[PDB]
Amino acid sequence: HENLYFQGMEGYRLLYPMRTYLIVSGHGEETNVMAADWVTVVSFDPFIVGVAVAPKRTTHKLIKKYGEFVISVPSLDVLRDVWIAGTKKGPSKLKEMSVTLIPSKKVKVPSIEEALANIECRVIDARSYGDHTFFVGEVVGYTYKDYAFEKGKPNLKAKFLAHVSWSEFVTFSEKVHKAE
Amino acid sequence: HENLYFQGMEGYRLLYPMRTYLIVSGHGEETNVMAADWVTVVSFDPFIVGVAVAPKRTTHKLIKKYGEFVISVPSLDVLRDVWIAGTKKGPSKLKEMSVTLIPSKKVKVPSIEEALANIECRVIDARSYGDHTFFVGEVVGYTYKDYAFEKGKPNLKAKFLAHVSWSEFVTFSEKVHKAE
Numbered sequence A, B: 001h002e003n004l005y006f007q008g009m010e011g012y013r014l015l016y017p018m019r020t021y022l023i024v025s026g027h028g029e030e031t032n033v034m035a036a037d038w039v040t041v042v043s044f045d046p047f048i049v050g051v052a053v054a055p056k057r058t059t060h061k062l063i064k065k066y067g068e069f070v071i072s073v074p075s076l077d078v079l080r081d082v083w084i085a086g087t088k089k090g091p092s093k094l095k096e097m098s099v100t101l102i103p104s105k106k107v108k109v110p111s112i113e114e115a116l117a118n119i120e121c122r123v124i125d126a127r128s129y130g131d132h133t134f135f136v137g138e139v140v141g142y143t144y145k146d147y148a149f150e151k152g153k154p155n156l157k158a159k160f161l162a163h164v165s166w167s168e169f170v171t172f173s174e175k176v177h178k179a180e
């Protein structure tokens, strides 16, 4: 991580491996995509999510400007596009990405056709905690690939993406352990 | 999920599978443990985390009372204890759990010896979003099993736990995909 003055494992690695998502922001020619690991659900009813975004991301500027974002769920198969989203800066990176933008249902920010799911969000809060803004978004629509969620739960065959360390990613075992 | 009036897939399942963690709260005879999926990192420097906790959890009462919590990282091997933490209520459940409580380094809330990591947190914010409180905790200490993080990144052999649907859990493939 940049800005690690005392060399060693970043403390946050203790929560890893974490899922990796894509955050879409802006629209029209301002459409941008970045990689985000620091995403979670914050409410069931209503459905509300949150994502921690550094002020230095172009994505940060776009979410503040428009008050909307999309969380797109990538699979392992689009890793190259995820790595571009997480390493290049601003809307020009899209020319380098195999992803197709399609209209969202409720938000003006586009969805990604290849994503396993697209979760459409309106910003309801933006708190600063240390070196990131935690953008909290009420979910106002969603679409998904029917097969990635057949029978109302994730289908592990879809290769949902997770992040181990800087350059290294994994998916899940297909081997399900039942708790009851 | 309880309180689903219109039967169907909960929208939040679109972020799944998610990692499953344990949240320790209270101390002495009030020590409690629950399961939590809705956890993420919110800052690198300083290291800050957050967890979404329903007001109805005993854990919610204990974090408000003491202003501290521990995120303990379970492996697949302690699934039975995780399921107890996520289904039974209050400190009496501990009598049913194979877990050993040990002192934390900085917080008064105990750590779990069997956990792959224990992340010690002081509450700095508690916002209400829909039906959960998002407790934000500055990390004031941590311990971990050396082997689960050998070479400063997670060791996939440690069987980090993730949640698919209600009763079903998985771990990660050991098969690493390199992005560069």
Ligand SMILES: Cc1cc2nc3c(=O)[nH]c(=O)nc-3n(C[C@H](O)[C@H](O)[C@H](O)COP(=O)(O)O)c2cc1C
Pocket (backbone or CB within 6 Å): A020, A032, A033, A034, A035, A036, A037, A038, A039, A052, A053, A054, A056, A057, A058, A059, A060, A082, A083, A085, A086, A087, A088, A089, A090, A091, A132, A163
């Ligand atoms: C796997 C991965 C996960 C990332 N997660 C986050 C995150 O949660 N929050 C964040 O602010 N940046 C994250 N980053 C960094 C941004 O994706 C990266 O800075 C990107 O180049 C920003 O692009 P932008 O300036 O177009 O918004 C991540 C990068 C990678 C590779």
Ligand SMILES: Cc1cc2nc3c(=O)[nH]c(=O)nc-3n(C[C@H](O)[C@H](O)[C@H](O)COP(=O)(O)O)c2cc1C
Pocket (backbone or CB within 6 Å): B020, B032, B033, B034, B035, B036, B037, B038, B039, B052, B053, B054, B056, B057, B058, B059, B060, B082, B083, B085, B086, B087, B088, B089, B090, B091, B132, B163
């Ligand atoms: C895998 C799993 C994950 C859970 N995640 C959360 C969560 O993120 N937040 C929450 O409030 N409850 C969560 N729950 C529910 C609580 O763990 C459950 O209500 C528990 O019985 C609460 O115990 P307590 O009353 O002792 O705090 C989860 C349950 C399971 C099984």
Ligand SMILES: Oc1ccc(O)cc1
Pocket (backbone or CB within 6 Å): A037, A038, A054
């Ligand atoms: O700001 C960041 C958050 C998570 C990452 O994996 C990388 C950068």
Ligand SMILES: Oc1ccc(O)cc1
Pocket (backbone or CB within 6 Å): B037, B038, B054
């Ligand atoms: O409040 C809850 C959050 C996540 C869960 O998996 C279960 C309950």
